[PDB]
Amino acid sequence: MTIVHRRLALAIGDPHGIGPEIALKALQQLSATERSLIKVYGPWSALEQAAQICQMESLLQDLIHEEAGSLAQPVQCGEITPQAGLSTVQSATAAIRACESGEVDAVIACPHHETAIHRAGIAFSGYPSLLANVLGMNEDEVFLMLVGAGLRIVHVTLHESVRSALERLSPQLVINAVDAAVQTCTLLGVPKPQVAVFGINPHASEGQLFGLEDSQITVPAVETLRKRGLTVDGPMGADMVLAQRKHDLYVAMLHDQGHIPIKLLAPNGASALSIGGRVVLSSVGHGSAMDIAGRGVADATALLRTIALLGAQP
Amino acid sequence: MTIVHRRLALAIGDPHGIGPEIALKALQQLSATERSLIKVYGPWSALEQAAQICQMESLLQDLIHEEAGSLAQPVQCGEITPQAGLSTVQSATAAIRACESGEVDAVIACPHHETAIHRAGIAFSGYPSLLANVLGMNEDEVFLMLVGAGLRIVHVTLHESVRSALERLSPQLVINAVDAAVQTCTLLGVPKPQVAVFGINPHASEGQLFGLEDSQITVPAVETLRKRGLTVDGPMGADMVLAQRKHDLYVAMLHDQGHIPIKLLAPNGASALSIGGRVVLSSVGHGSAMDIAGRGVADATALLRTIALLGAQP
């Protein structure tokens, strides 16, 4: 059964971690045709290392590959180094540039190590930020969509105090979040999705009874999106709309509104998609696992599921 | 199977609705011993009416009853009247006063009709507010706990703008909410609960990276609760802790944090418990059903489940 129905870039993550290993393990399970659709970005030495541990030398031949994040020294499985940190960011940057340019349709980034990246002197708050830099966009014009248990939830704000989020919220920012999420839905295999916008305040403010914010922010936003031809319900109380389960995309105003449901229904298998300017990037749901790196016992189910998600048939 | 292990007050709700009918139907399914623990508050005429339609006159004898919300005219099943609206509020007020005074340990309110109550010139936002008035407490000193799919979630703030809730939050307010919820856990059959406190900010502020609020409010609150002998984890990110499902009580900081999960896992079969002073009050999850009122088609499963919850063995 085929799962890859488009061209993907696979950035192999921290080359001292399990990233390289899970990359090979995942690709091995795909057919030849499927493998020809996945271009692997990262240092070749890391991949040779993982091949020898995993007995997958045969596979390296049939691998489309672009050298990125080359190492100046041998691979040290399980060690945190700035060298590995830079490699990580260079591989992901290459993958993203390939997607920006149209050479691939999406990017999957294998696990990084924040310490590694930090020690290299590189600021990194997440894949949202990274994606912003590379494309030269504002950090807040890149959005996180969680996907899990059939729920797709884009977040208009993310990793800041609730106060800070509320101060930042505006009609335009919501419109941008939806625009990004709707295009992403095309990739995922839902070309014209039915959208629901969450209320900032409880029950979407109940007119103005529980706040003015929804009347100033979410209501204008929805009316514009409707006048531009989009099918959008709301603002409605997050709690209520989610329970109905009659929409393809939900638009959370705050981190917890979208994160709580996803993690409740999918405490392991949720994908996190950073989306900006025609680039969709998903991390893999776990860390670099330095404790097991290079012992060849890492599961590549998560990565495979991530490939199935970004690879869906239109 | 016994389900009533303590003294309960049953306010029969709108006397033109199904409240009277489901009251009799529920009580009928209980044993004699169980019935002696339930004191029914409401007009006797409504109960005679429901008996005669449902052929349950035998039961009225063995019913502990206090006249409340008497009607000045015959019962008109299926009609919305201010008379029925007042009856509703008087019955519930009596039930609550019986709980306040220590005559019963909890209160169950059968369905009301908002229009009925409104036409009587009575303000009514919900059972939390009503409970506040009757006891003469501030609306913010009463807490809503939702119960459903194994989850019990008390809310420290409720029905106000997110900004307003954040402005209200304080160590003491959290401690109060927990104190109320923990006593309620005793009633519900969980003497020594394991508690988890949600973060105000995403990831409980991530030290102080995503705000100072958790270090000012939730962290102090937890340390006090621990020093007073409670087993309390957190503050932790709402999303994360909920997914673990290793706690008996969760403490939401905002409406949506607690409401989203409950409604998602239990779009029916969820209880709403208003708790203030020693009083625990639950609604039934449905309306007065004027379309069927007095046609003998109402099920009392929902009410019976509500009795099982507030009636649980210590």
Ligand SMILES: O=C(O)c1cc(O)ccc1O
């Ligand atoms: O699961 C989270 O709280 C989360 C953490 C991140 O670093 C990035 C996106 C997320 O959704």
Ligand SMILES: O=C(O)c1cc(O)ccc1O
């Ligand atoms: O579930 C809700 O949003 C809700 C609505 C109300 O009208 C009263 C209490 C609640 O908890």
Ligand SMILES: [Cl-]
């Ligand atoms: Cl009375």
Ligand SMILES: [Zn+2]
């Ligand atoms: Zn997060």
Ligand SMILES: [Zn+2]
């Ligand atoms: Zn509500």
